[PDB]
Amino acid sequence: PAQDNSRFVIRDRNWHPKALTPDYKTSIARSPRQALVSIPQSISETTGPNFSHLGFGAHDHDLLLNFNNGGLPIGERIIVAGRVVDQYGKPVPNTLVEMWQANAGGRYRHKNDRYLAPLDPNFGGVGRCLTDSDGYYSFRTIKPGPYPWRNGPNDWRPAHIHFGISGPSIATKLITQLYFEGDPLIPMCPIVKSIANPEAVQQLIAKLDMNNANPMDCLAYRFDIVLRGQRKTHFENC
Amino acid sequence: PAQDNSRFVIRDRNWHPKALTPDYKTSIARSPRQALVSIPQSISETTGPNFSHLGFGAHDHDLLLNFNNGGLPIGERIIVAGRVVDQYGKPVPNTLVEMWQANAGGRYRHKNDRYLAPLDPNFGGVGRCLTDSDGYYSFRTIKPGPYPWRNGPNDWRPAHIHFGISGPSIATKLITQLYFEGDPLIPMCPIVKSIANPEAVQQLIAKLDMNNANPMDCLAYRFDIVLRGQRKTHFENC
Amino acid sequence: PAQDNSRFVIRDRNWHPKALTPDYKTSIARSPRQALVSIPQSISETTGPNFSHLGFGAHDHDLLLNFNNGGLPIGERIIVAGRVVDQYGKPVPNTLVEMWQANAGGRYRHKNDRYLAPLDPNFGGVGRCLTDSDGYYSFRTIKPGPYPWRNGPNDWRPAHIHFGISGPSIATKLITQLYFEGDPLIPMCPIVKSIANPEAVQQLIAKLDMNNANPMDCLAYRFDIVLRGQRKTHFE
Amino acid sequence: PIELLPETPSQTAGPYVHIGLALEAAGNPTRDQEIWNRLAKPDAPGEHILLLGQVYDGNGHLVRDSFLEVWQADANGEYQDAYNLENAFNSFGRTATTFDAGEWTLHTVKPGVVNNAAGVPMAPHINISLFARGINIHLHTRLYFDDEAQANAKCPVLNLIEQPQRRETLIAKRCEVDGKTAYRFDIRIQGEGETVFFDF
Amino acid sequence: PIELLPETPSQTAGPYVHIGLALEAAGNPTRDQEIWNRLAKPDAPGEHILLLGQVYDGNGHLVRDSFLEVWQADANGEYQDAYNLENAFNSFGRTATTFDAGEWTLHTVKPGVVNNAAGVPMAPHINISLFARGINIHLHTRLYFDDEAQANAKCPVLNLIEQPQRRETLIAKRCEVDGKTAYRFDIRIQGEGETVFFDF
Amino acid sequence: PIELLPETPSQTAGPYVHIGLALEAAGNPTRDQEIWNRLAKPDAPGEHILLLGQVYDGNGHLVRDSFLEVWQADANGEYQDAYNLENAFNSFGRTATTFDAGEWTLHTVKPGVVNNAAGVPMAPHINISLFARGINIHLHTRLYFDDEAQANAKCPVLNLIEQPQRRETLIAKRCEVDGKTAYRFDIRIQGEGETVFFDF
Amino acid sequence: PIELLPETPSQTAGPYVHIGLALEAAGNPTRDQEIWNRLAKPDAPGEHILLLGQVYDGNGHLVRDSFLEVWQADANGEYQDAYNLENAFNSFGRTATTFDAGEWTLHTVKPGVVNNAAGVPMAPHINISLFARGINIHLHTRLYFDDEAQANAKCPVLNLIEQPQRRETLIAKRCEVDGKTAYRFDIRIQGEGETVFFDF
């Protein structure tokens, strides 16, 4: 079983979005009004699931083939790849990276999506993989379209892919969103702007990566992810 | 019939792309080696077709409906709209604007397109309209995907829509390409860079136009087009 | 038979003042705490009153003569003029512009005003007019004085005139305030500063307009007003 | 992106709004023609109704200096934009809360049904804009009627309000005032029972 | 001072979180192996329990699109981190609220006691991370058990909550669901009875 | 100096130009009305002729994806600018090279003489604009006729070409295609026999 | 976009390239072991062949200071990367043109068929890199064989050359030199018959 053998650098909650960001209307009623209670790290917080033994399907990381109903999805073919490191720069190997997204027209394959834009019969929109021994992951997909939502009267999410990353402990687990280099919708989005520091937003913007493209086939985008720094305990209890 | 009643400002052929731009490989053998011969404007050059009496179909300007085989095309729904003016700022009314493009995945509906990305059974990729009495045009379409081509070993066109504009004379007729605000492929493209002056390239970049979007439906991009300045003759023959 | 034939550009509610601006104390209890609910425009929102055949009196736009009790008001004689356009730069003709203000000493002719400064027996403080066919309006008045008010313990409104503009629909209707070029009270006012963006505040500052003055008579200030962009429907 | 001219920003109407827009309530003489709270002369077609209401702040106290503007269809579901004090009916009016009691009143007819832009019928409604001291930009709401339950249930505007409980805040209560049909429509700006406000 | 690389900032999981992490609930086909809400095979050691709850926003309305991740010791107080669908027990699981009733369920065993870093025993608990549309960064909480009152009163984590009344928000209520031992743990994100959320 | 707004810069029509401007040739369905290569109804006035040609690159290879726009006077020397598929004659048309043989065709009448701006008669001619993959801005040329030698020798436009040998590149060769009067006008973009291209 | 470290830029090998890479041709003593033009010892499996050629500039004159590097599969279609002067066969060698005659020679075996990355067989080929004074970055080409017409016709590399006439530039001519099978492969850097050069 798991042991308490490390500590995780405290989160900067002014770098992360705060809970109450009223331009993102749903956050008003879904944000606490009391302060978070700080607690020291124990084995409950410094351990978490490792997914090395989860059974992955052959195409789990390939959204071009994992919802195959007779053909290829329509859309901009792309590899999304990168490295998961911690704040000390150390690779995070064998960690679960999950992603989900809309199709090329900004339609989600989800019963609650009321957007008119059509489903793609060959696109599901979910992927998962494990980082390799050097911290690298990769997915193949189509670039999601922007899509309109009921926040303000004319609000549109930039093209984005939802990411979840487990990391070494429940303390490191993160859900975030990847955006795309140069998208003019990014600075207009109240969800992006839940993050108060524009330098923090920069960290969510995937860069075009021509070096990783397959010629005559697919483009590529690089998205590196930084989880909380992990260090050994020192001078504790003594 | 047509009369010679105007003159058109001489083209700046260092603002336009030159013919020989060898990074665009096909231009090497398809560019003249002799100088163009300058000639004065006559009725042959200062007149041209007016298309007011061409019969337009109801959906000719609407690429979401003009290739309807049972459903809507998959892709980012967009209006592309703007104004056609001349270099003096005067609107160019009742002029033919034609456009053609690939689908959301960068596949063209053309027998010679060898790209693997699938056709969309509900997308053709051509539109046409006439500017209105104030010079404005508009189309509805899906945003085309980038697509790979055999120039260099890893060359990709940015997302683009081909435009042809007639204007008042054969002297004004122009074919050009619209690109999209923020696309990181734009500065890497040898066809874009056929244009030597980056300020000229800026004129081909359509801007996101939220004011013209239909909420919960489609985004919009603005692309204004400037044709050669038209002026009356003065002090000629005398 | 008003008709739904246009759409109005969505408001930027970070340009406008937000509802909760606590330094303006009365906003604390008079601001919603739930988000506004966005709805699409219908004929209910895209139409509104046209006041072309409201009956205006001779002096409705002239505060120097519309409260005449045997003399002229005391104070700085001024013309307040400008153009009403939409965000596309289109003039807004035949639209209703209403204005109200204090007198030269900062005293309002209103039963609830407890400020000690005297009323002016020949000044009322209200005007109204229609923009002309090119979108222009004009009033003649006296420059209002600044006003102390019970917000913080030494708060003073800059000199200001309240404005109401109808525009083409209920969606365009706006109430705002005009301030005067150079007034050092402007950056100190918590009502002005309900507007977060100082470039938006700049849009409320009327500029001295010597070109529109009547020599040996009255000065003039220019205040242009921009209402929401109006466009035709497309692909609906 | 494309950026247009910025809209002139809103400011509060302030406590003395009545000087400009509600002359009698300020304690002042009025002009020959005023825009006020009688949308229907007695002879106008439709069911004649009195509307009344109070406005509450976040501490539950009356907002005694509220100013309301209203916009509604006539009984046949048509908006009448040509404002004229000679008309038997005008689609537009203005009211204000009294300083002692805090109550506003309107004299009108029940509006007919009008379709939204997609052709779907909306329940009978009066569009309201609320202005006051401490309100930096006016608040938009709608007054619907509790005796139109079937129509309210299917209104495509009401159905954009995610919680049913919030829809109830826009339904005015039928009653009788001096033998005449009336509806009470209270607005709570803030807190418990907070009235739905719209952006469009 | 020393500054490390900045952490990638959080964003909301959004309304369609189920596409990626709760496939069935999205309305979609599932893959061969899914991470879900049954932590214990029927013959796993310990006392088998059902956990269930609903999640409330600041207006008292159900949050019908919430997603929860849980982490707990097994019955012997050991964290089983080698996740595997063939394990008798996984310390990790996931659950989500149904859209109709807004209720999540988890099938597990009551966790054994584990010590904090100073060697002091913590009361039996389940670590919970709550994700949803409108939640910009996930909320951490703990589920403790109302039939462990002696342990709870001495828990060095519960004791970091200054007010005893707030400690009560973390104590699940023993009950019976279809005749089987269960504990209900409702979460109130905001307002009256607001659940304690932790930072660590 | 005075600087006007800059003209929108040209770009290549590209290989798939036919999608937009030569739908059939792309392999696609056509719309009710297309702008194409039959300028003259059979009973239009004047001498009915076929024009055809091939286009060569600097290596002597066929340019199989070229697109041509033409503009010419009718038989009476008048430019008919009101384009209409019901006209007996349109001064405007479009044609494209077949992919197999690289050959374009046009059905028209021989144009009548028109004067230049100084009143001097120009020899009968067709104004041509050539577009293709690899051509960044379209090339302007003129097609004149080898059986108009007297007129050609006095043309004030042909006379602006300094070298007589280059004038020869603009003279189409009279021939017969299926027994009918035709003129062949090959274009050499580059190299030996390079066609004269104009700027105006 | 993502930008890696820039590659060290190329420069011409220059006229004295032989000092470094072709010691005997410089007029210099050689070292014990040199990399040179005999890829196959007499006993290596496969058809033993002599290859020879000349290199022409754009004015049709011999490039007498050319240096060529070659890379080819053995007779069984396998690339042998472990370079060793003991091997019966090496996949790599070097040659140079003589200063008087301008001719280079290679002694090798005809390479077997190798598949491209998609599994399609390529015709037998030798990969050549050409270096010289006045060549700023080396030129890549392939030498194919005129007695493999059927395979050449189906080569997926040859088929990427758009014009058939250009494919002919890569086909070496079978002949006999002193009773032994030879192939001549001339390279024309520029102009008429210009050899196809590749980027990859």
Ligand SMILES: Oc1ccc(F)cc1O
């Ligand atoms: O926790 C809070 C955070 C921000 C705020 F405005 C109020 C709060 O109670």
Ligand SMILES: Oc1ccc(F)cc1O
């Ligand atoms: O290390 C600690 C951190 C937070 C806290 F509340 C108590 C601690 O002992």
Ligand SMILES: Oc1ccc(F)cc1O
């Ligand atoms: O079962 C699934 C597999 C792949 C995908 F993209 C979506 C699914 O619902």
Ligand SMILES: Oc1ccc(F)cc1O
């Ligand atoms: O908080 C922000 C983040 C990114 C941005 F572009 C603007 C913001 O106000």
Ligand SMILES: Oc1ccc(F)cc1O
């Ligand atoms: O597994 C770990 C344990 C302690 C530490 F500092 C780093 C690790 O990656």
Ligand SMILES: Oc1ccc(F)cc1O
């Ligand atoms: O016309 C030309 C243009 C550029 C060049 F390098 C050579 C030419 O003959």
Ligand SMILES: Oc1ccc(F)cc1O
């Ligand atoms: O006006 C002219 C322009 C160009 C030319 F070659 C001759 C002219 O007379």
Ligand SMILES: Oc1ccc(F)cc1O
């Ligand atoms: O005939 C057509 C109509 C519309 C379109 F997009 C393509 C076509 O080929």
Ligand SMILES: Oc1ccc(F)cc1O
């Ligand atoms: O000619 C150019 C045009 C645009 C650009 F970004 C780079 C160039 O070299």
Ligand SMILES: Oc1ccc(F)cc1O
């Ligand atoms: O038709 C025109 C004629 C002469 C001119 F200067 C401008 C025009 O638009």
Ligand SMILES: Oc1ccc(F)cc1O
């Ligand atoms: O409820 C709220 C709380 C704070 C804020 F800025 C706006 C709100 O609507």
Ligand SMILES: Oc1ccc(F)cc1O
């Ligand atoms: O359908 C809609 C719903 C809400 C909104 F704000 C705009 C819409 O177009």
Ligand SMILES: Oc1ccc(F)cc1O
């Ligand atoms: O009736 C009035 C007329 C003009 C004025 F300024 C104030 C009034 O109350």
Ligand SMILES: Oc1ccc(F)cc1O
């Ligand atoms: O919000 C403001 C507006 C104008 C100003 F001068 C300062 C501010 O803080």
Ligand SMILES: Oc1ccc(F)cc1O
């Ligand atoms: O749909 C509704 C409409 C009005 C109301 F009061 C409650 C509802 O649930």
Ligand SMILES: Oc1ccc(F)cc1O
């Ligand atoms: O110490 C406590 C622990 C749990 C609880 F519910 C209340 C307490 O005071």
